[PDB]
Amino acid sequence: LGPRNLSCYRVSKTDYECSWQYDGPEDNVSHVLWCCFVPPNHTHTGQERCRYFSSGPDRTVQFWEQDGIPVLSKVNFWVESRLGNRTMKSQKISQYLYNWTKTTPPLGHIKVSQ
């Protein structure tokens, strides 16, 4: 139960999109798409910056290259679904955006173990 299969990708030269599915009853459910990232700067402290989209009942989010989310650096995304006062979070994805398309497979990408 909860939000499931989160993916985000490029849909045009400037526009991007995140999509996800939700296992369970869909009535009176609201979703909040979260995005946090560390911007390349001159600060040595991490200084994580976060943005969010409230999409209500819909399970897609549209944005574009000038909305404030980096597309050439690693970003983290997850979905928080609300039913009543319970919030169900999705698993976190960590990816670039510029080289992802609607057909890019969500699994099978290399990850660095540190």
Partner 1 sequence: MWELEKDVYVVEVDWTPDAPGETVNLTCDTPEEDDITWTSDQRHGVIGSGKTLTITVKEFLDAGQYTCHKGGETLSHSHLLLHKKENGIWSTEILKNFKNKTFLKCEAPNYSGRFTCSWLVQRNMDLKFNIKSSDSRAVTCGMASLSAEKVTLDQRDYEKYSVSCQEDVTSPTAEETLPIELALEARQQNKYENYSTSFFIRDIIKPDPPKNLQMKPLKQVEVSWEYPDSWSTPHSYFSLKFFVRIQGCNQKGAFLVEKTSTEVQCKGGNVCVQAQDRYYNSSCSKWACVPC
Binding footprint of partner 1 on the chain (CB under 8 A): 13-14, 39-42, 65-66, 68-73, 96, 98
72 binds, among partner 1, ligand NAG, none (CB under 5 to 8 A by kind): partner 1
Interacting residues toward ligand NAG by CB under 6 A: 96, 99-100, 104, 109
100 binds, among ligand NAG, partner 1, none (CB under 5 to 8 A by kind): ligand NAG
Minimum CB–partner distance for residue 110 and ligand NAG (Å): 6
Chain discontinuities in the chain, listed by preceding residue (C to N exceeding 2.5 Å): none
Buried b (16+ CB within 10 A) or exposed e, 11-32: eeeeebbbbbebeeeeeebebb
Minimum CB–partner distance for residue 64 and partner 1 (Å): 9
Distance CA 70, CA 78 (A): 16
Minimum CB–partner distance for residue 72 and ligand NAG (Å): 9
Minimum CB–partner distance for residue 16 and ligand NAG (Å): 14
Would you say 29 and 85 are in contact if contact means Cβ atoms under 8 Å apart? no
